[model samples]
Target chain A: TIISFKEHTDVNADSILELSFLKLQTKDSCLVKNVGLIRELNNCLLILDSANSNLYVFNKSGAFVNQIGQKGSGPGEYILLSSFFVDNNKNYIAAIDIAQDKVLYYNATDFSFLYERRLPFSTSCCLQLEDGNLLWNSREYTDSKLSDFYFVVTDSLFDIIDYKMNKEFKSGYTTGPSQMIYKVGTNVFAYTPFDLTIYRVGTSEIVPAHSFSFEGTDIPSLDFLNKTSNQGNSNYLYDLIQSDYISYYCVEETERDLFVCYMKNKEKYIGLYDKNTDRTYNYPIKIFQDQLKVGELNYFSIGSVDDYHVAPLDVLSLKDMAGNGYVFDDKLSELLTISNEEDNSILLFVRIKK
Target chain B: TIISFKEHTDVNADSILELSFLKLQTKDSCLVKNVGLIRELNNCLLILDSANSNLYVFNKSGAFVNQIGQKGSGPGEYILLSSFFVDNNKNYIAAIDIAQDKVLYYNATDFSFLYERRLPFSTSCCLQLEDGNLLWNSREYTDSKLSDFYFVVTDSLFDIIDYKMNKEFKSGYTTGPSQMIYKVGTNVFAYTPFDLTIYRVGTSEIVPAHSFSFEGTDIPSLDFLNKTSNQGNSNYLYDLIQSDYISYYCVEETERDLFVCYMKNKEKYIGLYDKNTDRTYNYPIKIFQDQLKVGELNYFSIGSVDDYHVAPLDVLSLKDMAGNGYVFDDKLSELLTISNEEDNSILLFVRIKK
Candidate 1:
């Protein structure tokens, strides 16, 4: 299937997605940028602070419970925070630190530190498979012997289980990924960067799952970026903003649907793909038609629990809506009373309507 | 062996090299930039035009003879001109046009068109090996199938003989090379860039020949430039000028000596390694001490006849030296009488004294 240009379907965001708001209480030691929110095994929330690389824990009723993992090189510390995953089998929280070359696990209940194990190579993101083995989206390092291999599968003790993708230079369009690994349904999927094809990660190997091709505009392949030198240069570096081309793109997939949002320059275009409807609704700008008319989901985040997506809503806009004689739900109205302009912005959890 | 910084041996270029000069005849069909000069099997010369990518053949006595290939997509033309090779076995001229993906061969007798074969992949440079196989330092492309391989060895008919260096992302400090392959003595060597190791190219595999580790400043590796995201960006892009580091380097190796030059900002550091003496005379700047005061051999070129290195001498500087009562050889003085600042500069061929 091919997506066309200029034509877009305009459906209100409120009509497509079920939205809920939660307020995080102000803390003395914590400064929350709210870059990501990871839900634990017991319906608890962990707020990833983007600035300091710390995670703040909170219950369902918005009480600050505990904090886990800070930036340090000492015994219970991590240097570079990349991504985290929850262990459903062991009921613990495990996260990967790429620079420190270690994966630290913490107690899922109080967010206490459980264990830390060093990784053999630098990885971008990691995930737990159904068989309890870890799948890591690996990257190239100057000193790592495993730089020839791409994806690494490891057992619980961190021994190499299997490795795939022998790092072919001309086989793919791009190299690295932002949110590399994802769990769509019972099987996990690896987003191999900018090729527009997602691979289904199995225990032994990976297979291609989905691919997208747009008929109107050309997506910037790795070759387009590297048409000249293979190092730090691009042919389209200067004038790519005004040109009508898709420079960056990412797709968020679920069991029943997929939401693809792409950026041209400053304008964001999105496609809401429904597997059941067998159709796609692409919006040039996905706006929200709510009771308070809070614009739209400004940024799509990798933070997701089950099928629900997560985004941070501006706090000042809700207060501005309250002054204009707008009423909100009790959960949102109580959130507005607690969250001031200076406090952390409220988090909005979204799920596409069935 | 290692090259140490600061302790440099300043030797006179005139004492080290035997110099000669010739005046090129002016013609309306030629505008020579003197970027490279290829001496034919008959002791004639081919001048490479940097501005036009055309090759002009000249006799040993400086008379314009014939022109070989030019820029076009016609039957006897090329689109992108990369590097040309003089075939000693067949007594023909063969060149690789990387953008056109073709190896165009011409008659070396009068520089006439003979045959051209479309290459399977785009290559940076091509050279004739000892066994009549062509070696190509290949790069990555969107459509090429050989991007997984680095150095390509092919038979005379352009069929793949052997491919090596399976494109590992993180094994070395750099990927590409400036003057990638060189023939030192009777053996071919590949200067794998930045890591300071030259590999001896055999029929089956490449063996490491030499490595130099400096005690002072660090050479910018592929990992150093790519410490950040591996895209069109660099961490040291801005302030790398004033910093004391080796950014770009190249080597012009002969049978008995290897002239190594590296650039830090505006300063050029050189080392002349003599295999016979087993010592390198490190020159801070190789100046000329001659009867005629020419400052230095400013730029070293890849053009060579046996062990003689080639460079372009400014015609006006020689005339100014003659006016200041500086005596030169009869050929050089005769060249100054026929040359002006507007005309093409003279070519200098220098072989180090044994």
Candidate 2:
């Protein structure tokens, strides 16, 4: 189904089903260094640290299981950590190392090195499809050979499978996991840093899936590309895009509604499109249950826990957010009691209801 | 003088002066690893490497003279390197160390440790103003002690000189040198990642210098800062700022024009504002002299070589850009002959004309 904001009903942040907290701090690890990406498999959570360059796995009880990967140039090691994907079908976790230009695979259960594939180009982010296809967002190019392509498709053995290129991605820097192509369920989505058009990835085809419409706002001119003489055009475009326009970054679908989180004017916002009512509820996430004041743009949905539930990792300031004495569910309340003030992060586990 | 785009005469890449090359490659120093900031003082070039956490100084002839500040936790050493400035009046080089929360001073002529001052907040970029004041863009908060300030000004003895805060800087992540406050000459400038208003720094005051206008575009709503439920508002802001919006990262003022290099969408555009004419001419800065294709948002101004010229450090793809039969000035052409392909960088000394 094509997602459209016009046919959706309006909603608010009050429509949220349940707000819960997942305290990662325990006796094992005091605080999470920095959360780069999060993935769940068989009820277990995998948290990737962008600063420390390691992956920490946790069981259902939020108990730290094992640390996978380390910072190094040797095999099974990565210097600059970009992203990691836990593929249940393949039963492996693939980590993209931009510094060494390789994707190292590890056993999902034990977190041991399996093998790796050398990438031809430096990638900002990588993911594995359920069908066992490798997808990477190419960053640096040796020549103009791959300049036409943004997302490079490859097999498990690192052989080129396909190349998906769009004219909008023609002349801009493409880096960061949020700006690259990502897979959710069987469908993959991608958007350029400058464009608002969102595309869905098919088996061998890419098509425009959604066109975000900012109410009462005019979309600026995008004609200037690779040229150096258009000051008025470029400045107008820059002012609009930087502080005026709204572009979708991540999208997810639930049983009752479709959820999209995007950046507009520097703040992070979530749009919930109700399928049954055909209404869209725009929420500027400010506070969590009137206790936590969101600091900056730090939270994002990794993927859905199930068809009816979605898991969002919201990095909160525990000093300002925690110990509000707000009533919560039994499990979440217990998790909060053990949470430490010195810890760097406390993730919010959001549950959606149809 | 008020800088206006309406009256400034438009120009192109051809308006750029005869481009010169400073091959940082020599028999003594094979390559310059990860150039963070470049400063020209007393006809000598000072290059700061973020990767190696060291500073390399070269004379006018591009000969390696000496290296300063090794990586350590010791008095004269720094672990994490951010940005550096050469104070010609004081005859010392000041380097900002974010890891250790200190700004170390070194003798400009000899590159020796003079002294160091502890910083109260984490700063990614720093500048020494002409009035002998230190300015830094604050990133994170510790105990909410600095929650009221966006940019901090300090005396030479690490005493608080003043604090510059606004509603736009009231919330948002302020990390990365390109995403923080930067200097041009006597004036300092900074902008919030989510807002389009650029502020100019005066002695103990912050004034709204310019409000960028995007014609035919609506400035997206920015209500979301943090929290997960406000996905609708946060996502729109995130999408617009990350993919669509243009934020000013650095600025430089020249005799004839006000140079502002900013990130428009994802590509870097350098705008030369003609002061006399009051109109701005923007160059999307794709290819340099039909040779070097600028990579991602890597190039930046390293202060003016003189009143009539400015030097931009364009992180070029040398292997592909150079050796393409592109003619250069005699000194640069001779330097290119000794340049090794293995050298990771070749500094571009761009001289802008009126």
Candidate 3:
């Protein structure tokens, strides 16, 4: 059943999960400039840094393995490192560069440059499927004659194998980040900031997979969307949230449950859907509990690491927790000892099952 | 009489004045890899290409004169090019590299690197004041203990001379091109996407310049802004525009008039404020006419070349116009003949009457 956030109160989130913490090394070789996109494969974490256009890899123990990519226009270099995909099965990692209009692939086993291919249009995000097909969200509909699709599927060599234009409403903004195509197990899902309806990527078609409905809110009409510019549309959506209307911006699924992140009255909430119980739990999480009360630190999810773990990044609360004499596991304390105030950020690994 | 688009019909835009075009070069040595930022100084056009991290300089006759800057971690190299400002009177050009957290100043006359300075925080846009100070829009409150301010003024060496946090609301998006700051004659002005209020930069203080109110829309509240994430906030703003509410994204002033660029219902409009008559005219410019009614391109101000000239770039509309047998000044037709669809884009130069 659909759980409504309207019933949210001061009640503590029902017990079913607990969050663990891990400190990424901030040493010279393992330093991360800025966190843009994060992906998990096997026991390795691939972190894409937008600031330096470098991708750093680390093992589960938080030891730096190697770094891939650099800022340039050469065979292995990219102008901007937008998004990345990790395929542990094939030991492959690919990075997308919108400015250079190229995707540089690397051998993840050795972190060496593999081969690069050119893209017809700029890409927002990409997902590599089980069959080795690359499904990408086109930043813009570059070709009006090419079936008018919002996404294109290409082979490993960048040939147009298939394409789909699920929605007629296109992104009107000139530049900025948009949601990437996500994969959970075998199903591929996609959506945009302006549209809350999610679609499933099929072998030859894209169909509606899920649509979220808040107690009092609904998606703005396409007629209204067509009349608004990017910024104008953003304000309208904010108003919906401010008025206590629910609007989901992110959705993901695991084997046991589905997690959808939404906002109501400008406050963030996480909707936990338990597949076994067929019930949803709405939890408004803006602060983390300290020794006595909740501390003032904004917590948000980066994404799911795997079926059992989701990572959240927040620097302020972790520092507060440390200063308040909170107990942490061995690895977490080491990260806190090494992290300085302004330069380093911590990653929280929360297990869905307690 | 302020011009309003409320009464606009599907009719041709009233022509109090018309537009002219001047094509930039597309050949080697002068070819632009991608158009990131466009500026005009003296008689030269400077185009920044983020793809190659190089700035190409060409004369009004489409002649490649020189190139500046390179991509690297060296003394003058930049990781990511954000914004730039030019001072023709002082014969200088300065660019901001947000990723590197540095600003590189150069001799505009000879296109030589002068020096680079470290910034306290990342900047979205910057302007070199007439007195040699740099005024920039601070992207975030890098210092939590410091008083909240939106912008900071600094000396040539990047030392903070002064800072001002005029508005509590800040831009929510991480990436994408958003208009930050603009200069009008002797006065410099800035605004964030979340706050429509404009401010004028004085010698020692920033004062409120102008505030806009649409017939049926108002700016979103700070409370709503703080609760929303980057994409959520963007949709809210876009909704206001779609609902026939006017929201100005860019503003500039010339000798004869003040031009405000805004989006309503996703359609682009220019509000021409005539200083002579103390009147503003809202012109809904969906397209420029030719054999067929080619829709207006997404038009935005490229700052000003001088006190009398401002440039707007819309490569798609220009390409369509050229292909439709629309007449252009001789120089423009020459550019169209040499330009291929995917490779190059055209720049429009408009002169406001003095």
Candidate 4:
């Protein structure tokens, strides 16, 4: 069963660039991550593309797990691996290539590659879909003039599930330049391209669903826009939904209930769009911003609503009196609970008590 | 005492975006922040703004000390505090104000109002100089004007430092919009406005140090020519420096034999601009890149060049590593010690062996 999480916000000791499950934590019915590199993964931790190519997998009590690909291009070569996904069912790790044109699938247990696929057209970001299929999305290479392609496939022996196409596309737009292929309920299919335009791709006419075009000044050249989109800030479009130079859009397994969470330059907010009720709510998170204080290590992470906790890089438990978490001096077990009744309405605490 | 840091390319993991301080191990520092929040000093800690209001303190083991302002405004208020500074032996927090038409400066000790200064004109940023001067760096309000104002002391106060009039010069190009003041050295300065020109203020005239003009773009509005002066990639400009999005030049400091380092993207090189020699060396840092993993967390703090180490975050007893007195995390840090094993290369690992 696909359990979708609602848009939730919580402040950790810092901003979470990326996250993954700990390999050992998976076996114990508990999911663990290295938070940040603040502390080592105690148990077997699973780290995705963090600040750089550094990936970490930790144990249940937030101890050191193991280290993955260092910075290189040898056998398990990876220069700049961007995003990653771990399929719990099939037990595999899918990592996006540094070239932004391919996806590498490996055994989650041993980090052995099962197969690699190329989506030459799409920007190849990680898009989680409903049918246990990983979608490799990219944009048209301007020099090549090729249409952006969305390669949907699964690790069930390197089978191509679907090939969704888009002609008018570019890589690295604040909204545009990305593609999200998700299943709505059972029959309805949706394709949200990067250009801030949402489209429906099911049975009827594959037309635009919701469009958000940024109209301030005319956009610069694709090269200039690409350069800035690759660098500078482009969230003049929306402030609330932009955080950590990234925007998060939560795609529900059920349609008409999409929560577009924007993480731009490190601010988090949710723009809830419910097509069922034909309404939307732009919720500003005062909780995440309030828990923030002076001189404390804090970051943020997003996961299954109830199980998601944005804690410090070292420890896993939330402080009971401080509303923050702590790490041990060396690397060992940690104890943390909510501090001084600071609200936990937004933050979800996760620890390995067992 | 001012700290000097020569950013090394080995630290930037991704070719596109690299957090310079990962090497500093400020992951534990509270004052060190990502981009979201600004740092508010409590007790003692110096920091830089990361993505989320998450502060990353660099000094004293670079442990994450605490957080700062959030999404609201009041007495110790900041709707969006963008920049920070420590002046007159007092820590001052400056928040970019829209409705206030001025920059907010609060006492770092008590979070009390030291002073507030109005813009010289309608500008976005107000910067404090080393000698307690002020620079009215204006923001691009429209398609036409871009100007930088240097001030002279006319009025003075504990909070509001007085300033008289200086020369008001139009920046070579119209900025892309986001305006900032990045101080390179004591008197030397540089700024890469959205306007796309890297203009340097020499002792005499304002010179166009370099220009990567974004020409003939498809989207014209976003195409602000030469949008940035110092960018990432491969080319490290000799004079160009960066604080946040703000980049500048430090010819004054460089003339005094300060090794100013700049990176186009992940690749970094040092600017050995010697006033007596009048010549310099610029090359791809092959050795530095090879030794340190490209994705490692590397940060620098300057202190008369004698006390430089990349282990503020990691705390690896590297203070007396390279006796050359340039104990930095560059290409040489690894190799300078490697040759010690093969040949007696000048006591490379100069240690205080017990």
lDDT of 3 by residue, B1-354 (tens): 123324333433334334555556666665565566667777887877765667778777766788777778776777778778886376668777877767777887888876565565656578877676878776664345223676788764355787775646545443223446777666778775555567787559767777665554444555654554353345455445445444445666566666666665666566565577565555555443231133344544455555433343455556777677766556556656676775455655554343
lDDT of 4 by residue, B271-292 (tens): 3333353433332344433333
Highest lDDT: give the candidate number: 1
**Candidate scoring better on TM-score of 2 and 3:** 3
Model 1 misplaced stretches (Cα beyond 4 Å): A1-354, B1-7, B141-145, B166-178, B228-242, B285-292, B296-298, B317-334
User: How accurate is chain B of model 3, given as a TM-score from 0 to 1?
Assistant: 0.79
Tell me which residue pairs clash in candidate 1: B173-B222
Report the lDDT of model 4 for residue A76: 45
> In candidate 2, what are the lDDT values of residues A34-67, reduced to their tens digit?
6666667777777777767777787666678777
Better of 2 and 4 by TM-score: 2
lDDT accuracy of residue A346 in candidate 4: 20
**What DockQ score does model 3 reach against the true complex?**
0.01
TM-score of each: 0.45, 0.44, 0.45, 0.30
Estimate every model's Cα lDDT from 0 to 1: 0.65, 0.58, 0.61, 0.37
DockQ of each candidate relative to the true complex: 0.01, 0.01, 0.01, 0.01
Misplaced by over 4 Å in model 3 are A1-11, A87-91, A141-148, A174-177, A230-248, A287-301, A312-317, A320-339, B1-354
Estimate, for each residue in A1-354, the C-alpha lDDT of model 4 and write its tens digit. 112223343434223212222212232222333232121111343545344555555545544455554445433445555566555364666666655345556676765545444433345455444454445544444454233443333323233455565544244343522224533333323444234545555322345555532212122334443454443335333432332333444333233244444444444454434445454444344443233321123443322222223333322232322333323221111112322222211222322111
Instruction: Write the residue-wise lDDT of candidate 1 on B277-334 in tens digits.
Output: 6766555553332432443456666657667766777677767778888767666677
| Candidate 4: residue B247 lDDT (0-100) | 36
Candidate 1 global TM-score: 0.45
